[PDB]
Design an enzyme around this catalytic site. Structure first.
Site, PDB file in Angstrom:
ATOM      1  N   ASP A  76       0.961  16.696  10.270  1.00  0.00           N
ATOM      2  CA  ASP A  76       1.365  16.456   8.874  1.00  0.00           C
ATOM      3  C   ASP A  76       0.155  16.193   7.998  1.00  0.00           C
ATOM      4  O   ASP A  76       0.159  15.267   7.180  1.00  0.00           O
ATOM      5  CB  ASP A  76       2.388  15.309   8.744  1.00  0.00           C
TER       6      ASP A  76
ATOM      7  N   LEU B 155       0.831  -1.199   0.000  1.00  0.00           N
ATOM      8  CA  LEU B 155       0.000   0.000   0.000  1.00  0.00           C
ATOM      9  C   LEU B 155       0.872   1.257   0.000  1.00  0.00           C
ATOM     10  O   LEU B 155       0.508   2.257  -0.620  1.00  0.00           O
ATOM     11  CB  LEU B 155      -0.953   0.005   1.216  1.00  0.00           C
ATOM     12  N   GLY B 156       2.007   1.179   0.690  1.00  0.00           N
ATOM     13  CA  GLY B 156       2.973   2.261   0.806  1.00  0.00           C
ATOM     14  C   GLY B 156       4.340   1.790   1.253  1.00  0.00           C
ATOM     15  O   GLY B 156       4.461   0.776   1.947  1.00  0.00           O
ATOM     16  N   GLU B 157       5.381   2.538   0.851  1.00  0.00           N
ATOM     17  CA  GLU B 157       6.792   2.305   1.173  1.00  0.00           C
ATOM     18  C   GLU B 157       7.463   3.612   1.548  1.00  0.00           C
ATOM     19  O   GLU B 157       7.160   4.648   0.953  1.00  0.00           O
ATOM     20  CB  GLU B 157       7.523   1.682  -0.019  1.00  0.00           C
ATOM     21  N   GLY B 158       8.377   3.557   2.509  1.00  0.00           N
ATOM     22  CA  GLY B 158       9.108   4.733   2.962  1.00  0.00           C
ATOM     23  C   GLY B 158      10.178   4.445   3.991  1.00  0.00           C
ATOM     24  O   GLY B 158      10.526   3.282   4.219  1.00  0.00           O
ATOM     25  N   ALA B 159      10.705   5.522   4.620  1.00  0.00           N
ATOM     26  CA  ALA B 159      11.753   5.465   5.644  1.00  0.00           C
ATOM     27  C   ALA B 159      11.309   4.611   6.836  1.00  0.00           C
ATOM     28  O   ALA B 159      12.078   3.763   7.300  1.00  0.00           O
ATOM     29  CB  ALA B 159      12.115   6.871   6.103  1.00  0.00           C
ATOM     30  N   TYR B 160      10.039   4.793   7.269  1.00  0.00           N
ATOM     31  CA  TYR B 160       9.361   4.084   8.363  1.00  0.00           C
ATOM     32  C   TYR B 160       9.380   2.550   8.170  1.00  0.00           C
ATOM     33  O   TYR B 160       9.410   1.803   9.152  1.00  0.00           O
ATOM     34  CB  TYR B 160       7.894   4.580   8.485  1.00  0.00           C
TER      35      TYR B 160
ATOM     36  N   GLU C 246       7.260  -0.302   5.579  1.00  0.00           N
ATOM     37  CA  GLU C 246       6.236  -0.545   4.553  1.00  0.00           C
ATOM     38  C   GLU C 246       4.849  -0.826   5.163  1.00  0.00           C
ATOM     39  O   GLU C 246       4.722  -1.117   6.350  1.00  0.00           O
ATOM     40  CB  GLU C 246       6.652  -1.689   3.596  1.00  0.00           C
TER      41      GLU C 246
ATOM     42  N   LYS D 223       1.146  -2.117   9.140  1.00  0.00           N
ATOM     43  CA  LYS D 223       2.328  -1.271   9.062  1.00  0.00           C
ATOM     44  C   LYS D 223       3.486  -2.059   9.665  1.00  0.00           C
ATOM     45  O   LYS D 223       3.435  -2.448  10.830  1.00  0.00           O
ATOM     46  CB  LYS D 223       2.099   0.084   9.760  1.00  0.00           C
TER      47      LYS D 223
END
Ligand SMILES: COC(=O)Cc1ccc2c(c1)NC(=O)c1ccc(Nc3ccncc3)cc1N2
Length: 270
Positions: free
Chosen positions: A120, A13-18, A20, A36
């Site tokens: 944010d 659904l999403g990917e990032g620094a945190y 996936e 998450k």
């Protein structure tokens, strides 16, 4: 009873620094959840998420720790991000933007009421369920600004520059609530014009200077009707102490303007 605790990870659904976020489907019930996955801040995100219970806030079901990796079980929102409902340089129909803005206010009123600031707010962090109900997402940058009925002034640089209030770049300390009101105003601008008014709210930014000089014949303001624009004139106010509060946004003329028909219900004739 057996296999109800088993979830298949079916897509990213999403990917990032945190880390996936994966869409998980229950092996038995086929219930969809968002998981998450944090490689390992996260302790604070979980603690804040445990406090939240509102129809316009992504629901937290719980967490599990498998050694180093943390699994956060969150309410799946099948409609994706509000970001992808914004047509570049156009926006979206004004009744849709009003409905999303009402649901965004309900969510923010709730968080501020329990002394939480998201910090944010932007269309990427505003998710839609199967009925296009808006849900505030990702409490990774969120903090407590009110505890034991005592307000704590903030000082940390948080957020995304096009959505950040000008006091965050100018003042050492600031009130949390007018910062979230401001980002909500930028989200409303994006919904009605399909563009962000400036890279950041500083005097060195020509677009920001134009707005303070009330040059509303320029883009993005030229694309926005006079009634929502009058609301934006009250939200995007440089002085946070003079900026409109949410109770006053609920009294604004465009906020209460009838525009939107209810969800299309099945009907027959004769
Ligand atoms: C397979 O995709 C689809 O069918 C449509 C789609 C696309 C992107 C997202 C969603 C649904 N829904 C989410 O709940 C979602 C959940 C989490 C998320 N990102 C987060 C990142 C960090 N913390 C929390 C959420 C983004 C999301 N957007």
């Amino acid at each position: 009873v057996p296999f109800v605790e088993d979830w298949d990870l079916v897509q990213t659904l999403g990917e990032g620094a945190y880390g996936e976020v994966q869409l998980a489907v229950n092996r038995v019930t086929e219930e969809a959840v968002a998981v998450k996955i944090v490689d390992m801040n996260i302790k604070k995100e979980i603690c804040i998420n445990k406090m939240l219970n509102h129809e316009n806030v992504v629901k937290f079901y719980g967490h599990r720790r498998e050694g180093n990796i943390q699994y956060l079980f969150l309410e799946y929102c099948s409609g994706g991000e509000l970001f992808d409902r914004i047509e570049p340089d156009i926006g979206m129909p004004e009744p849709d933007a009003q409905r999303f803005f009402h649901q965004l206010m309900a969510g923010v009123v709730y968080l501020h009421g329990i002394g939480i600031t998201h910090r944010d707010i932007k269309p990427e962090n505003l998710l839609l369920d199967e009925r296009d109900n808006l849900k505030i997402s990702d409490f990774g940058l969120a903090t407590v600004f009110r505890y034991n009925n005592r307000e704590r002034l903030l000082n940390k640089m948080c957020g995304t520059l096009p959505y950040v209030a000008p006091e965050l770049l100018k003042r050492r300390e600031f009130h949390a609530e007018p910062v979230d009101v401001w980002s909500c105003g930028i989200v409303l601008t994006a919904m009605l014009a399909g563009e962000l008014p400036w890279d950041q709210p500083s005097d060195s930014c020509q677009e920001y200077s134009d707005w303070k000089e009330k040059k509303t014949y320029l883009n993005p303001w030229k694309k926005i009707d006079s009634a929502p624009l009058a609301l934006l004139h009250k939200i995007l106010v440089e002085n946070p102490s003079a900026r409109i509060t949410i109770p006053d946004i609920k009294k604004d003329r465009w906020y209460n303007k009838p525009l939107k028909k209810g969800a299309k219900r099945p009907r027959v004739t004769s």
